[PDB]
Amino acid sequence: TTEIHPSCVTRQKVIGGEVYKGMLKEVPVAIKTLKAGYTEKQRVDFLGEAGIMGQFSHHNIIRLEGVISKYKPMMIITEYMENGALDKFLREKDGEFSVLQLVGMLRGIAAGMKYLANMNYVHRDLAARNILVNSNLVCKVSDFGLSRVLEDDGKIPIRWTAPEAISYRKFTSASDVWSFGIVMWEVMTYGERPYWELSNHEVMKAINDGFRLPTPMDCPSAIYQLMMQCWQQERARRPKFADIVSILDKLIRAPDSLKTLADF
Numbered sequence: 001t002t003e004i005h006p007s008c009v010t011r012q013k014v015i016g017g018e019v020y021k022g023m024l025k026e027v028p029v030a031i032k033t034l035k036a037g038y039t040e041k042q043r044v045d046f047l048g049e050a051g052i053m054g055q056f057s058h059h060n061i062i063r064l065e066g067v068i069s070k071y072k073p074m075m076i077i078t079e080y081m082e083n084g085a086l087d088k089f090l091r092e093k094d095g096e097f098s099v100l101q102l103v104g105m106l107r108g109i110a111a112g113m114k115y116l117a118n119m120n121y122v123h124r125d126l127a128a129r130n131i132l133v134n135s136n137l138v139c140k141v142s143d144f145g146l147s148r149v150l151e152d153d154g155k156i157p158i159r160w161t162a163p164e165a166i167s168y169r170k171f172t173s174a175s176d177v178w179s180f181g182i183v184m185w186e187v188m189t190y191g192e193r194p195y196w197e198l199s200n201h202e203v204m205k206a207i208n209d210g211f212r213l214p215t216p217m218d219c220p221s222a223i224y225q226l227m228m229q230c231w232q233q234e235r236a237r238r239p240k241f242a243d244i245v246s247i248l249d250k251l252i253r254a255p256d257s258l259k260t261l262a263d264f
Ligand SMILES: CNc1ncc2cc(-c3ccccc3Cl)c(=O)n(CCCCN)c2n1
Pocket: 015, 016, 019, 030, 031, 032, 049, 062, 076, 077, 078, 079, 080, 081, 082, 083, 084, 085, 129, 130, 131, 132, 142, 143, 144
């Protein structure tokens, strides 16, 4: 990773230690800090996130500019994503995009996830809140935090998580595909919360009994079919990210295919 001198960085506004929007000398950056008195585990986890991010070079994965590790407070410096987190963005822009735009967002996310999977990285916490959006509507996977625990067992939420990951702690790229299907539903609904007010136990019971999320309004049939396949109980029946990228690319290149809507 690039070691950046603190004099080349100015923090301007808190946007999330803390996360700041700032400038790198100028280019806008996001800046995550670690506070004094951090433990050995905290340090390994913090610098670990940067270490992971530094091993990746892909359009749909947040870019690391560098780290401040020689000086305190320590910092991770990334590209700045002008539209922020995808979940909040969708909810504040409800109805404002074309179906083609929404599908193109999903293709980007899927391409990033295919790259992570092929680089032997299991995300475990894929959700729209962990995707960032730039001023070209490019969606990039973020959140490579090392220390994550499943809710009731950062907390990884049950209702984005595959059955096998919940039931026996088996997290793989196939569990990330399940999560991706939930992200598909988040995007096509402009940030609706999956399963609404069902409790975690009600969601798990529903899933195990064969229920799945219903079609979004105005959702292309092909898109609903794809998210449904991501939620197969049997991992081997789920598409790989390779398959998802291939299918989304075909739909985008023949965009009339998206005019055929699933019954709402
Ligand atoms: C608002 N635009 C914006 N742009 C870029 C980033 C980058 C980071 C980040 C991520 C990992 C390591 C280090 C960093 Cl700095 C970050 O935490 N936020 C805050 C929101 C994240 C929500 N999920 C970002 N926000």
